[PDB]
Amino acid sequence: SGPPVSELITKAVAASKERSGVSLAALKKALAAAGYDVEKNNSRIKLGLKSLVSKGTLVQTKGTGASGSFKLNKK
Amino acid sequence: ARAKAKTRSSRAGLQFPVGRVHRLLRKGNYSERVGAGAPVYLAAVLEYLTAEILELAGNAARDNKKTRIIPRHLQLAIRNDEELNKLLGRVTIAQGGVLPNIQAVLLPK
Amino acid sequence: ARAKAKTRSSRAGLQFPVGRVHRLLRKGNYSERVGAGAPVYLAAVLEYLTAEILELAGNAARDNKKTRIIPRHLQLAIRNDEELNKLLGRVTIAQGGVLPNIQAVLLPK
Amino acid sequence: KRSRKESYSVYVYKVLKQVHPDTGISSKAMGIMNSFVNDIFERIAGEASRLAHYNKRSTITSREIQTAVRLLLPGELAKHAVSEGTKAVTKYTSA
Amino acid sequence: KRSRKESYSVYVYKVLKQVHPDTGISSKAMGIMNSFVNDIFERIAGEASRLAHYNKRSTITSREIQTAVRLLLPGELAKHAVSEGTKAVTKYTSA
Amino acid sequence: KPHRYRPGTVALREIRRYQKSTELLIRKLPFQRLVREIAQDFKTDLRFQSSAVMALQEASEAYLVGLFEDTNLAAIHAKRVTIMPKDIQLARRIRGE
Amino acid sequence: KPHRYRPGTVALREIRRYQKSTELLIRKLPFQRLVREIAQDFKTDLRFQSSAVMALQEASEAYLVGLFEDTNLAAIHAKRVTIMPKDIQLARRIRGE
Amino acid sequence: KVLRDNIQGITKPAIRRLARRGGVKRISGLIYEETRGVLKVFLENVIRDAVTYTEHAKRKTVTAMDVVYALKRQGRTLYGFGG
Amino acid sequence: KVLRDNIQGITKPAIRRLARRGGVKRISGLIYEETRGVLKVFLENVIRDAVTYTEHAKRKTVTAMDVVYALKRQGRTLYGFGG
DNA sequence: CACTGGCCGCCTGGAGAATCCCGGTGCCGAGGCCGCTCAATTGGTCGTAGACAGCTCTAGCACCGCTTAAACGCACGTACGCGCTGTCCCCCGCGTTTTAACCGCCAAGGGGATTACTCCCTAGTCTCCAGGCACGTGTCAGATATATACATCCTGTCATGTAAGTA
DNA sequence: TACTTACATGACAGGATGTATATATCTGACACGTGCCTGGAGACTAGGGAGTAATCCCCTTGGCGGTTAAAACGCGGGGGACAGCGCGTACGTGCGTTTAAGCGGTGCTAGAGCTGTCTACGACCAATTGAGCGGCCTCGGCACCGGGATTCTCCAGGCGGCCAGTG
């Protein structure tokens, strides 16, 4: 069980903070370093990405939808 | 007082006609003259080739529980041997169709 | 007592030798008989081929401003002609290299 | 009547019954085998002519056609063909 | 003592000077032209031999090579070689 | 609800069915008409043996089969399950025309 | 600081230079050594004419550069510019070797 | 008398069946017309050879042995009708 | 007299310069050994054919004529060496 | 919410090395001439191959009628390529270092090639005869038909993970 | 923050259907019997190509002394490959309709194709020659070298626009 995976996504994207947004490669390897079944949870991380983009906490840098790269919002 | 007429196919123990292949070489205009062992060697080569591809054809037909060879059996004979396929990659069999050959990537998961 | 010696090529107004191609066809063993128009026809075809290719080589050498042809000129002559590539798709030219052929994506921007 | 039109059908039948007495054959497959015999024969004849002309040979011998098999026939098929032809020519030379 | 090796030297040099009087040759390019004439001769002669085999004619006439030049050479090159050979054989019959 | 199969499954069954098949895949009469049509562009009032129409039929379909095996190789090389005519064009270009 | 060109334009400089070039790119002596080494595997004590080693060198060079244009066609099919061994295998398969 | 379009008689389902033989699982709409075109080119090449043979045979009906010979020239020697 | 590792005799820059003639801008690291392998099998075919030509001639010195003939009968005719 | 500074992306101007590009120098391979020789030519004959002429007889041309799968076009679910934004890493490029290839030179003999001799071998031809071709004809393997099992496969209902609300 | 809850996504199960699986039948193509004659060979002969010894000489093989070009290595790093993923998207698939191919059925004639002629033509020997190739030289077109110009290619300053920060 444990905490929800969206929190893991938030800490993974807040860990790096590049000038540009973080794409899915560095995100999925950040989860792999933190510890996650990234191979069997592509749909789970896809719905997590859709949830975090749609609700407005996180903003997309240059990509469209779940494609592309992602940064933190203004506040 | 002529001797009894034997056949060169029986002389070399072959089933292919040494006479017909020799005539086809002599009248096919491939050299001015032909050494005598060459048609015998040729008939032996074709006899072995036809024999083993009929081996594959008969075994494939017995695998498909039919006793009579259709050209599908010949396609299945030739295309299932790599070395014959190196011999006959560019050759089309009439009504043989295609060897069962499906790429694994386009097969589903 | 004898007719003056007159070659068949000058009779045809061709400068590839008709007797040479006739000789090489007779001892090339393609048939036991050859029609009299056949070697002069073949020599005419070859003379048109060589005249065309030496015209292309001469223009290529003039554009490379060199007086004598080089196999680079012959490679440029063959590759810049469509039907010659149709004729010699499977032909290697010694020290001819390749035609300058850079794909559009390889260029920058 | 008609003029006799030649084919290798009887010899294909003979080797077929030799290696598989129990099986049958169709006419379309028979034509395929006749085309196969014609094709392999003309290939070997062409290579034999080229080897004869390159050595300026006015005859094609068992050496020439053996060479032509080694050129055309790939690998262990060629070695078995050499073995079969060698056995055949030794039996023929034994009269 | 050396034995003569025959080639197409003075003929290709003649057709060159007729097509370009002021353009020279290298020896390597000259070998390329020798190999070209040999290769095209082999292609036409072999195709003609197969044609004579097909129609059971024992001879290669000008019509056999006319067939072969429509076969191997495509289009403009073929028909203009046909025209050259046609006027060539008419001049040959007129001499 | 009328029963309906997912895409590609019927396509794969088609692939299996006609690789298993050996018959002629083209309607015979329009092929005969087309080869007569192309023939009339070359010489007028030409006729065909039925066997010549047979042999052109099997050769045409087999040459097309060879192009589609080359197409398949190029298409999987292009990582696509849907083929495009540029793949056939590349296949023609590499095949040596 | 010493001058340095961007990755690739030296390669295209080589492209332009070597398509204008005609010279044999394979080193003569190790190519001769490789021909002797391959031939000794099949038949012993084989001697090679210098012109024969040459003709093998243009043979290898032209065959390989033809296959390299072929693989570059495969690469621009595959939206790539760096060719891979699978492009080579594709060319080998679709050519029929 | 004359015919102007029979290439469409090599129908879209028939081209689909041909590609189903080759293992093609999905076919875009662009391919069918170009395959008709290259089939026109290939049959043009073969039948040009065929009329050239037949005219050299001085016949006015094409024989299948002409077809096999023309395919043998082009390098796709066809078994099943030789002789 | 015996030679062992002449597969590396065709050096990596030699392969790169071939592909420079081959119109290749970037060459992967896996290319060199596998192209060495395909060159090896190509020369295996060609030299096997040529050696068969030589021993058919009962000769021990390999000649360029047999090389260009081995090339030609594989559909790879070469110009400029007496072919 | 409006002002404002700062930094990068492109515009715009600069700078220096690689190769044109232009002039200068020797040297080698082109070709022109000489010698040779052998192959092309011609006359004439022998022989024979194929177009001509004529017939004949068979499968395609031509036409005609019934039928149901070909196909075909629309609906609609639904699988598809692909640009893209990074990220990963991997050869490209620019050096330095090292070594053996190239050049130049030298000695050896291997065998490629040529000539000569000789004899092994093979087409030709008449003839005799015999084995597969032509042709006819019976007949069970399968081409077709009818009833049944199982893949299969897609779909109906549960399990679980998980996101969301809450004490 | 743990505990409880309810829905998306797979887990598990199940029935329709197309293709495989069980015999029944009748058919004609395939297997088999018959006349033969066209073709397979046997023996002798003519004669011709090729196998083999010698040798020689020339072209290849073996060997050495430098030489940096070339090979090899290492680091900086820009760039190539690409994993996935929405997103428009184009095509597979189901299914009734249509029509034109398929089946099956008749006339025939034009054309494929076999047969007698005799001519057109080609193959081939002796003599003769004249064009075409080996040898050699010689020389200027080309191989090599030295110095500006330009072109390419990276670099750098300026402007604007975008982006971020604060009162």
Residue numbers in the entry:
A (entry chain U): 35 to 109
B (entry chain C), C (entry chain G): 10 to 118
D (entry chain D), E (entry chain H): 30 to 124
F (entry chain E), G (entry chain A): 37 to 133
H (entry chain F), I (entry chain B): 20 to 102
From the publication, what sentences describe this entry?
Here, we report cryo-EM structures of human H1-containing tetranucleosome arrays with four physiologically relevant NRLs. The structures show a zig-zag arrangement of nucleosomes, with nucleosomes 1 and 3 forming a stack. H1 binding to stacked nucleosomes depends on the NRL, whereas H1 always binds to the non-stacked nucleosomes 2 and 4. H1 contacts DNA with L1, the amino-terminal part of α2 together with L3, and α3 to stabilize the nucleosome and contribute to chromatin compaction.
H1 is absent from the stacked nucleosomes of the 4×177 array, but is present on nucleosome 1 in the 4×187 and 4×197 arrays, and is present on both stacked nucleosomes in the 4×207 array. H1 that is bound to nucleosome 1 always contacts entering linker DNA via its helix α3, whereas H1 on nucleosome 3 uses α3 to contact exiting linker DNA. In all ten focused-refined maps, H1 shows three DNA contacts, similar to what has been described. The H1 loop L3 and the N-terminal part of helix α2 contact nucleosomal DNA near the dyad, helix α3 binds one linker DNA and loop L1 contacts the other linker DNA. Furthermore, exit DNA of nucleosome 1 shows the highest Δβ value for the 4×177 array, which is the only array in which H1 is lacking on this nucleosome. We show that, with increasing NRL, the linker DNA emerging from the stacked nucleosomes is more relaxed and permits stable H1 binding.
